[PDB]
Point group: D2
Chain length 87, copies 4
Amino acid sequence: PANKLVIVTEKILLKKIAKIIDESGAKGYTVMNTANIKFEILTETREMAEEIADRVAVKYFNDYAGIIYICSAEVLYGHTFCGPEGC
Amino acid sequence: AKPANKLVIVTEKILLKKIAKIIDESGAKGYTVMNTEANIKFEILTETREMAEEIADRVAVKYFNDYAGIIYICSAEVLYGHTFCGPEGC
Amino acid sequence: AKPANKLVIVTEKILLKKIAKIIDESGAKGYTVMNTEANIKFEILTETREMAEEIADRVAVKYFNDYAGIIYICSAEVLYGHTFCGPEGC
Amino acid sequence: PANKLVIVTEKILLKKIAKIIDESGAKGYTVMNTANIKFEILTETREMAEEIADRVAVKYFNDYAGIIYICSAEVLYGHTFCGPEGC
Ligand code: NA
Ligand code: NA
């Protein structure tokens, strides 16, 4: 998958955020204690990661502390060769 | 801290030691490297965007005329934030 | 520190929330969970062997009569060591 | 793979240990700064991990500091079902 979302926030939100991640269609996530927890979620699309982030921040970030980071893969260099069997 | 920048390099196995040395010289925090038998894949963590670009430019300029590979980068940006700190904590 | 004990659980997707709650209650440091569509795989880190066994026993006793799964553990032991410390460092 | 070796040691040994890992037949490794570096190596067999550890400690651990940890997977519980298409 070409996109990664990271959410660092208060431990109290663990179950509520895990449920958002499940409902989003994401294939999995990592969560670790880091008073605070850090989620990492890989997504096939940019939009899926943005939508998780919107749902979490709109629901919780007026009342709870947290930070959400996103990245999308950008190809910098490429050199490819293939033939009939290998393409 | 912001998450580390991630650089991924997929290329020919023969370049393993030369690329590992480039990664070390750049000041990267670390990397994973795996066979993916003819090919290897590096996933490299760097503190800054500039350090990841240094590795990418060094590898591609030196080798990508003669060897096959792909290099991509994932650099985190803040999308939402809500933080508090006081006398002991900032 | 010794590396964390690793517990891996592969089982049916429907148990996702019940197992995540067991992992949290046990005091584990964290976990990864991934679809592996019908099945999920947890990889869980725990500070102690006892904490990983607690999760394993809780999950298998509660669910493994009725649901399919496998649970395995990897607990690190020291094989070789050579360490030095002095006044500032021990 | 069912076995994991972890080596924590002095940064000066980075290239020498990476070369041992390559020569062992292992499929890959992770290495991170942790003055010190930490290697993680997954191996298909217990013997492969032990052999990496022996080679590193015999060569270096009289003169350099480090620690090497090993684990092998132990199945605790299992319940399997399959039919003609799925076994
Ligand atoms: Na709120
Ligand atoms: Na020595």
